[PDB]
Amino acid sequence: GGGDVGRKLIIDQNVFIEGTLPMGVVRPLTEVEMDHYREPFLNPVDREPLWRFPNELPIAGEPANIVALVEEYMDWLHQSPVPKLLFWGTPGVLIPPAEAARLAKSLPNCKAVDIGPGLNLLQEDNPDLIGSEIARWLSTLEIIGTGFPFDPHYVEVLGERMHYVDVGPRDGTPVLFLHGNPTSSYVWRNIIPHVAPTHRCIAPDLIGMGKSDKPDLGYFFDDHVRFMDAFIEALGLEEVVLVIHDWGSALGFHWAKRNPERVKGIAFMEFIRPIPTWDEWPEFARETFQAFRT
């Protein structure tokens, strides 16, 4: 029946972690890094978000509700004067170089930065360029390590505990870092130290991911929207700068569309846009993502 093939891969065999995660990094992840990425998902039942996410991707018009939501935030982004910083690599996964270049020209107030060879987790291939460029860009606004040496923070959100990194000073505009699938705040570990000297860095683990709680949800995008909206409010955030990636970019752009006065800049990379046909998905990943959605 529907879903059996993709669930066997992602839920039973843990393919998103053991296979697709390496497919998203140009360099080889170390065993220590793999173990940090594996930690939330040792129990197969906890792998639901890893499977629902690729089934939410807006590919070939489906699911229609996600396609519409993403089209809406992309239209918002095209009409917004907010400062934008777009990182891209070659060949990319979600964003081919030609699309990055086009968006750098068509989006208002947008600087683009080539990180060199990159797939999906650009932060793993060139953290020092991404971090240093974010830090320089923040200084203009009108506002590779394997460890995770951050003090834990936890906040109750709609009755569920969410984990986050929170470092840097409390007397400015904070920078909110949003990860995607199948990562956690760990993906930002080598970016945050470039920013923390000047700006507060807040990096939550999405519900069901990282060190956040694992409620019995379907882990649709709607669930992530609800929990991230409530996380932001539970921290009392007013205005923010966003640094977003992958499904975290869908969260960040959708939040910005709904809260435009509160977004003072967006840095983004390997982000969710509508993929009109399977031909626009990279061949090396096409049979994999088709199977995930079977």
Q: Which parts of this chain interact with Cl ion (CB under 5 A)?
A: 53-54, 181
| Angle ∠(79,83,85) on CA atoms, nearest 5 | 110
Nearer to Cl ion, 80 or 120 (CB): 120
Whole-angstrom Cα distance, residue 254 to residue 144? 31
Q: Would you list the DSSP string of 8-58?
A: IIIIIS-HIIIIIHHHT-SSPPPHHHHHHHHGGGSSGGGGHHHHHHHHHS-
* Token reading at 267: 């840095």
CB 94 within 8 A of CB 271: yes
Lookup: tokens for 294: 């079977």
Q: Considering beta carbons, is residue 23 or 112 the nearer one to Cl ion?
A: 23
Among residues 118 and 265, whose Cβ is nearest to Cl ion? 118
Sign for the CA dihedral angle at 260, 262, 265, 269 comes to negative
Smaller CB distance to Cl ion: residue 138 or 207?
Answer: 207
CB of 94 to Cl ion, least distance (A): 9
Q: Which is nearer to Cl ion, 58 or 168 (CB)?
A: 58
User: What's the min distance (Å) between Cβ of 14 and Cl ion?
Assistant: 15
Return the half-sphere exposure (C-beta side, CA atoms, 13 A cut-off) of residue 85.
23
Name the one residue in this structure whose structure tokens are 């983004």: 268
Query: Which one, 54 or 89, has the nearer CB to Cl ion?
Result: 54
CB 83, min distance to Cl ion, A: 27
Kindly state the smallest distance separating residue 97's Cβ from Cl ion, in Å.
Answer: 21
Give the DSSP letter of residue 62: B
Q: Find where tokens 């053991």 sit.
A: 18
Q: What angle do CA 253, 87, 69 make, to 5 degrees?
A: 20
Shortest approach of Cl ion to residue 181 CB, angstroms?
4
CB-wise, 227 or 281, nearer to Cl ion? Answer: 281
- Taking the least distance from each CB to Cl ion, the nearer of 80 and 181 is 181
Euclidean distance between CA atoms 23 and 54, whole angstroms? 15
Q: According to DSSP H, which parts of the chain are helical? A: 4-7, 15, 21-23, 31-38, 48-56, 64-79, 97-106, 122-125, 127-138, 192-195, 221-234, 247-258, 283-292
Q: How far is the CB of 133 from Cl ion (least distance, A)?
A: 25
At its nearest, how many Å lie between Cl ion and the CB of residue 255? 19
In the complex, the smallest distance separating the C-beta of residue 259 from Cl ion, rounded to whole angstroms, is 24
